[PDB]
Amino acid sequence: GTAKGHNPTEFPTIYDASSAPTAANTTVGIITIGGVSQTLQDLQQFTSANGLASVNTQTIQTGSSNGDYSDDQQGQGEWDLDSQSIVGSAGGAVQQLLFYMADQSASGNTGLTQAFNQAVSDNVAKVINVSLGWCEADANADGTLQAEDRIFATAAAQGQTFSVSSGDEGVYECNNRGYPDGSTYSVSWPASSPNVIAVGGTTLYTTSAGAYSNETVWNEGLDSNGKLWATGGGYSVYESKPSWQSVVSGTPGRRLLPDISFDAAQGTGALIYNYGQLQQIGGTSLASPIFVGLWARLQSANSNSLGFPAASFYSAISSTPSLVHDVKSGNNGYGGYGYNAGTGWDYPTGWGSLDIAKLSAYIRSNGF
Ligand SMILES: [Ca+2]
């Protein structure tokens, strides 16, 4: 297999989703910080270049009508990654793409919080992407965790699926966002919520013919600043273990994450239009929108009747290994520290990535 960049329109082939319906019957949301004006131009470039019908979008100011929803330049790259990867993974069609924009002028983390809140309150997107996060302990310290967890709990009860990137700092999330720290491990919020699907990162290898070859842990080592680039994973120090995670024996009574993983290495990342220019982008910021697009296809295949799927993922995958590509090689730390991949669920990558047609078959037979 291999390592190379990929048009996101290739992810259905890679994850065995070509035979499923598109997300044409499912509305998808994306949480952003600030506006998406350039992102929408880049999305038009994306759909036109690929010869696809245009995507129906809506942008939503989730806070004050006088809030700051101007474009954040770097943020455009994120909303580009998310939107193009979702539409690609979805087979080139979603019913509507909703950008839930956080006010940038609001106090503390309240803009982001109100963005989550709006998506849950409106309850129109079935699946919502969150390619963001930070040290759960910081979020815990200022009350943001507790506030946001209530919103996500509502989501799950409503049958919405929030998908959250697990982080890009490996085990060193709380050490100044990814500086190596020995045996001191931490995790990201909101991925550590038991009310979201946490999505980790892989190194994706494909055959010359573009088929799936294999996946290892995403760990690209240190950048020039000395920061680790690797898939977030471990367990929450605050959140209790939801009962469905009991199938992973020998772990603490805490929320383990991630749940599943998809492509995240920059070296095997997505080719994304950003301010009109193609760039090769990775991170768990990539992995999460891939999941969102694929899961939105299964929703469309199931009349958007699939509820919050965490429990079903754990029961089904633990009893049915063929539903996943099980990552077995690599680690998410540095210098010999960190968690190792292995057979079955592991801390770097969870269950690994989904084989979509096999999961669809499972759902047809068993529900979810
Ligand atoms: Ca594994």
- Secondary structure (H, E, C), 174-201: CCCCCCCCCCCCECEECCCCCCCEEEEE
Catalogue the E-assigned strands of 288-352: 324-325
Q: How far apart are CA 261 and CA 290, in angstroms?
A: 9
Q: Is 250 annotated as a binding residue?
A: no
Say whether 333 counts as a known binding-site residue. Answer: no
CA 350 to centroid of ligand 1, rounded, Å: 6
Q: How many residues does the chain have?
A: 368
Measured at the CA of 255, the angle between CA 253 and CA 256, to 5 degrees, comes to 100
Q: Where are the domains of the chain?
A: 1-368
Residue 342 marked in a binding site: yes
Q: Is 226 left (phi over 0), alpha (psi -120 to 50) or beta?
A: left
Has 94 been labeled as part of a binding site? no
Interacting residues of 143 by C-beta distance below 8 A, sequence separation 6+:
none
How far are the Cα atoms of 104, 124, 306, 309 from residue 119, in angstroms, in the given order? 17, 7, 18, 18
Active site residues: 78, 82, 285
The sign of the dihedral angle between the CA atoms of 350, 353, 355, 359 is: positive
275 phi and psi angles, rounded to 5 deg: 50, 40
Tell me which amino acid residue 225 is: N
Distance 3 CA to ligand 1 centre (A): 20
Q: Are strands 127-130 and 23-33 parallel, antiparallel or unpaired?
A: parallel
Among 188, 323, 353, smallest CA distance to 259 is for: 353
| Cα distance between residue 322 and residue 350, in whole Å | 15
Give 3-state DSSP helix, strand, coil % of the chain, rounded to 5: 35, 25, 40
Among 249, 245, 247, CA closest to 259: 245
DSSP code of residue 268: G
- Three-state DSSP state, 9: helix
Compute, in angstroms, the gap from residue 83 CA to the centroid of ligand 1. 28
| CATH topology classification for 1-368 | Rossmann fold (3.40.50)
216 Cα to the center of ligand 1, angstroms: 9
Q: Give the span between the Cα atoms of 347 and 131, in whole angstroms.
A: 19
Ligand 1 centroid from CA 234, angstroms: 13
Closest-CA residue to 344 (of 215, 232, 248): 248
For ligand 1, the distance from its centroid to the CA atom of residue 146, given in whole angstroms, is 31
Q: Separation of 351 CA from ligand 1 center, angstroms?
A: 6
- Per-position b or e across 43-66, b if 16+ CB within 10 A of its CB: bebbbeeeeeeebebebbbbbeee
The answer to whether 223 is a known ligand-binding residue is: no
**Ligand 1 center–CA 214 separation, angstroms:** 12
Distance CA 94, CA 97 (A): 7
Determine contact, residues 261/347, Cβ cutoff 8 Å: no
Taking the CA of residue 200 as centre, how many other CA atoms within 13 Å lie in the half-sphere pointing to its CB? Answer: 38
Q: How many angstroms does the Cα of residue 70 sit away from the middle of ligand 1?
A: 41
Q: Is 351 helix (H, G, I), strand (E, B) or coil?
A: coil
